[PDB]
Design an enzyme around this catalytic site. Structure first.
Site, PDB file in Angstrom:
ATOM      1  NE  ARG A  24     -67.289   1.745 -13.281  1.00  0.00           N
ATOM      2  CZ  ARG A  24     -66.975   2.954 -13.732  1.00  0.00           C
ATOM      3  NH1 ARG A  24     -65.723   3.379 -13.729  1.00  0.00           N
ATOM      4  NH2 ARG A  24     -67.937   3.734 -14.230  1.00  0.00           N
ATOM      5  CG  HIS A  54     -45.634  24.018  -2.450  1.00  0.00           C
ATOM      6  ND1 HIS A  54     -45.684  25.072  -3.348  1.00  0.00           N
ATOM      7  CD2 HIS A  54     -46.636  23.173  -2.806  1.00  0.00           C
ATOM      8  CE1 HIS A  54     -46.696  24.889  -4.182  1.00  0.00           C
ATOM      9  NE2 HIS A  54     -47.293  23.749  -3.872  1.00  0.00           N
ATOM     10  CD  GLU A  61     -44.369  15.282   5.669  1.00  0.00           C
ATOM     11  OE1 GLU A  61     -45.513  14.775   5.593  1.00  0.00           O
ATOM     12  OE2 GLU A  61     -43.535  15.196   4.743  1.00  0.00           O
ATOM     13  CD1 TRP A  83     -48.244  15.576   8.081  1.00  0.00           C
ATOM     14  CD2 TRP A  83     -49.390  13.691   8.472  1.00  0.00           C
ATOM     15  NE1 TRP A  83     -47.464  14.532   7.691  1.00  0.00           N
ATOM     16  CE2 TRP A  83     -48.137  13.356   7.941  1.00  0.00           C
ATOM     17  CE3 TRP A  83     -50.297  12.664   8.791  1.00  0.00           C
ATOM     18  CZ2 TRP A  83     -47.765  12.017   7.677  1.00  0.00           C
ATOM     19  CZ3 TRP A  83     -49.921  11.351   8.582  1.00  0.00           C
ATOM     20  CH2 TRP A  83     -48.666  11.040   8.004  1.00  0.00           C
ATOM     21  CE1 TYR A  97     -43.707   7.677   6.886  1.00  0.00           C
ATOM     22  CE2 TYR A  97     -45.569   9.129   7.353  1.00  0.00           C
ATOM     23  CZ  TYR A  97     -44.937   8.220   6.536  1.00  0.00           C
ATOM     24  OH  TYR A  97     -45.527   7.872   5.392  1.00  0.00           O
ATOM     25  NE  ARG A 129     -21.485  -6.420   4.195  1.00  0.00           N
ATOM     26  CZ  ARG A 129     -20.260  -6.808   3.886  1.00  0.00           C
ATOM     27  NH1 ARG A 129     -19.456  -6.051   3.155  1.00  0.00           N
ATOM     28  NH2 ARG A 129     -19.858  -7.993   4.305  1.00  0.00           N
ATOM     29  NE  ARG A 130     -26.422  -4.795  13.080  1.00  0.00           N
ATOM     30  CZ  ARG A 130     -27.408  -4.063  13.625  1.00  0.00           C
ATOM     31  NH1 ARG A 130     -27.790  -2.901  13.106  1.00  0.00           N
ATOM     32  NH2 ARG A 130     -28.013  -4.511  14.717  1.00  0.00           N
ATOM     33  CB  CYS A 149     -46.333   6.115   2.166  1.00  0.00           C
ATOM     34  SG  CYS A 149     -48.079   6.154   2.122  1.00  0.00           S
ATOM     35  NE  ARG A 169     -47.941   1.836   3.305  1.00  0.00           N
ATOM     36  CZ  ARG A 169     -49.097   2.380   2.906  1.00  0.00           C
ATOM     37  NH1 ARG A 169     -49.711   1.918   1.837  1.00  0.00           N
ATOM     38  NH2 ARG A 169     -49.623   3.415   3.562  1.00  0.00           N
ATOM     39  CB  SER A 170     -48.541   3.271  -1.363  1.00  0.00           C
ATOM     40  OG  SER A 170     -49.678   3.604  -2.166  1.00  0.00           O
ATOM     41  CG  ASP A 172     -50.578  10.759  -5.780  1.00  0.00           C
ATOM     42  OD1 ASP A 172     -50.344  10.938  -7.010  1.00  0.00           O
ATOM     43  OD2 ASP A 172     -51.398  11.466  -5.140  1.00  0.00           O
ATOM     44  CG  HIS A 210     -50.858   4.803  -7.285  1.00  0.00           C
ATOM     45  ND1 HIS A 210     -50.217   4.141  -6.259  1.00  0.00           N
ATOM     46  CD2 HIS A 210     -51.483   5.866  -6.711  1.00  0.00           C
ATOM     47  CE1 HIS A 210     -50.410   4.794  -5.120  1.00  0.00           C
ATOM     48  NE2 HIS A 210     -51.174   5.844  -5.366  1.00  0.00           N
ATOM     49  CB  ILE A 211     -50.552   8.124 -12.927  1.00  0.00           C
ATOM     50  CG1 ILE A 211     -49.040   8.012 -13.127  1.00  0.00           C
ATOM     51  CG2 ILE A 211     -51.068   9.506 -13.311  1.00  0.00           C
ATOM     52  CD1 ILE A 211     -48.653   7.979 -14.622  1.00  0.00           C
ATOM     53  CE1 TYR A 212     -53.856   8.725  -5.999  1.00  0.00           C
ATOM     54  CE2 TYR A 212     -55.868   7.502  -6.537  1.00  0.00           C
ATOM     55  CZ  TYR A 212     -54.842   7.794  -5.658  1.00  0.00           C
ATOM     56  OH  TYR A 212     -54.806   7.165  -4.428  1.00  0.00           O
TER      57      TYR A 212
END
Lengths: 260, 256
Positions: A24, A54, A61, A83, A97, A129-130, A149, A169-170, A172, A210-212
Site C-alpha cells: 500500500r 490531445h 510524439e 517525457w 522507442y 508473416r515476419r 510499454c 506490456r503495461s 494505464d 489496469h485502472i488506477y
C-alpha cells in the site's frame, strides 16, 4: 447510431471483473491480463469522443519516434511535456522507442532501420508473416530511462488493406491507452499511405491492463456517456515516412464529450 | 457446464471468415485464444496431439543449446530439415531465452530473470521474455514464430500471454498451446504459485488449403474434458525430465 466502443468496453470490463492490487504505497489498481481492442480504421479515426484526447501531443510524439531522437528537446519546444520526468539533465533518454525503431544496433555498425525495412516489405512482399518492428531490445534495456510499454507491432495486408497489431506490456487504461491507440492508428495510416494501400484494422493487445484507484470516479463518469461518431483523419502525403510534419496531419469533425 | 473450445472456435471462424490468399491459405490477423489452466491442461481432445514432442522441444529450448543433436537422441525430428551439416541452427529460441548476447560479450538469461521476478517481484509489468533479437535474425535458420511472452500474477495465480507472429492453425498451433501452457505450469511450480490463464495471441493465423478436410473433420467432433497435467517438481527450471511430465485423463478423438 450506437457507435462501437471497444475501448470503453474493456475499461468497463476491467472495472467490473478486474483483480484489485494494493501496495500500500497509494498506487492501487484493478487489472486484467491479456486483453484486446480492435478498430476498423475505415469506420473512423479512433480518437476517443467520450473524453478529449490531445491529438497534437499524439502527433508530435510519433513524429519524434519516427526521427530516431533520444533527446527530449524537440518535444519541449513543441510544448509536449510527456517525457520530461524521465530525461537526464542534458535532456537524454538513452535509446528508447525511436532509436530502436530507426537504428537497432548491430554489434558492428550497427543500425537496423526497422521502419524503412517494414515499409519496403510492405511494398515488395506484403504477404510476409515476419513484418514486425520491436523496441524490446533486451541488451539495451539498461540504457533506457525505462523499458518500452508499446513494445512491438506487426503489419499485415489482406484485399489491399493494411492492418496493424500492437503488443503493449503495461496499460494505464484511463490515462495512457487512448493516446497509444490514436498514435498507432496514425502510424498505420502513415504506412498505408506511403505503401499505396488502404486501411484495415488496428488491433491493440494488452498485457497488464489496469485502472488506477485514483481514477475510479473519472472512469465511472466516462462510462456514463454516449459515444459520438469518430472523427476523420485528414493526412497529407509527405515525401516519406520520415518527412511528415504537424501541417500534414489534422483530424476533422472531432466532437468529444467535455471534461472531466 | 459445456467443454470450452476456444482453439476450435477460432479454427472455425478463420475457415468461415478468413480471406483466401495464394501453398494457398486462408487467414485472419490479430486473434486471441485463452484457456483457464485450472480447468484443464489444453492438449486438444478433438484430435490426438503427440505430447512427447511438445515436452522435448520445450526441455531443449530451456537448455539453451541450439544444436539439434539432443532432440535427435530423443526421437524428435522436427528441427532436422533446418539443421546444417553440423546440426547447428544458429541462435534460435533458446539461445535468446537463456543467452541474449550483450555488446561486451556477456549474455542475458531471460528465463532465470523471469523466474527471479516471479519470486521476488510478482507484480512487475515488465516480466517479458523475447526471442525477437533483430540484430541476430541474420544468423538464425529461421526467425522465431512464437516470439515473446509475458508473465503476470494475480491472487496467487500465474498467467502467461504469448505473441506468435505466424500461426499454422491446423498443424502448429496445437503444439504451441500445449507447449506454453506447460511452460507456464513450470514457472508457477518453481515459484510456488497457482495457475491462471494461458492467453495465446496470433498475428497471421492461417489454414493451408491442404488441410481443408482435415479441418472440417476436426470441427465436426465433440470435445471431451481436457486432461490434467502431472508435473513432478524438478530441482530447478532447467532440470525437468520426460519422466517428470505426463498427462492424465486424456481422451482424444484420433490422429488426423
Amino acid at each position: 447510431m450506437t457507435v462501437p466502443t471497444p475501448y470503453e468496453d474493456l475499461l468497463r470490463k476491467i472495472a467490473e471483473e478486474g483483480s484489485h492490487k494494493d501496495d500500500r504505497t497509494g498506487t492501487g489498481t484493478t487489472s486484467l491480463f491479456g486483453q484486446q481492442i480492435r478498430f476498423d480504421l475505415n469506420e473512423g479515426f479512433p480518437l476517443l469522443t467520450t473524453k478529449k484526447v490531445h491529438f497534437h501531443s499524439v502527433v508530435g510524439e510519433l513524429l519524434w519516434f519516427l526521427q530516431g531522437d533520444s533527446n527530449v528537446k524537440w518535444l519541449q519546444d513543441n510544448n509536449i511535456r510527456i517525457w520530461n520526468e524521465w530525461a537526464d539533465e542534458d535532456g537524454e533518454l538513452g535509446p528508447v522507442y525511436g532509436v530502436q525503431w530507426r537504428s537497432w544496433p548491430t554489434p558492428d555498425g550497427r543500425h537496423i532501420d526497422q521502419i524503412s525495412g517494414a515499409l519496403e516489405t510492405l511494398r515488395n512482399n506484403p504477404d510476409s508473416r515476419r513484418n514486425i518492428v520491436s523496441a524490446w531490445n533486451v541488451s539495451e534495456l539498461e540504457n533506457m530511462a525505462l523499458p518500452p510499454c508499446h513494445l512491438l507491432f506487426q503489419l499485415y495486408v489482406a484485399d489491399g488493406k493494411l492492418s496493424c497489431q500492437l503488443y503493449q506490456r503495461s496499460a494505464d487504461m484511463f490515462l495512457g491507452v487512448p493516446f497509444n491507440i490514436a498514435s498507432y492508428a496514425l502510424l498505420t495510416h502513415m504506412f498505408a499511405q506511403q505503401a499505396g494501400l488502404e486501411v484495415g484494422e488496428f488491433i491493440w493487445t494488452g498485457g497488464d491492463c489496469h485502472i488506477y484507484d485514483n481514477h475510479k470516479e473519472q472512469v465511472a463518469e466516462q462510462l456514463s456517456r454516449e459515444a459520438r461518431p469518430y472523427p476523420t483523419l485528414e493526412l497529407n502525403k509527405a515525401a516519406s515516412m520520415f518527412e511528415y510534419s504537424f501541417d500534414d496531419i489534422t483530424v476533422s469533425g472531432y466532437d468529444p464529450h467535455p471534461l472531466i
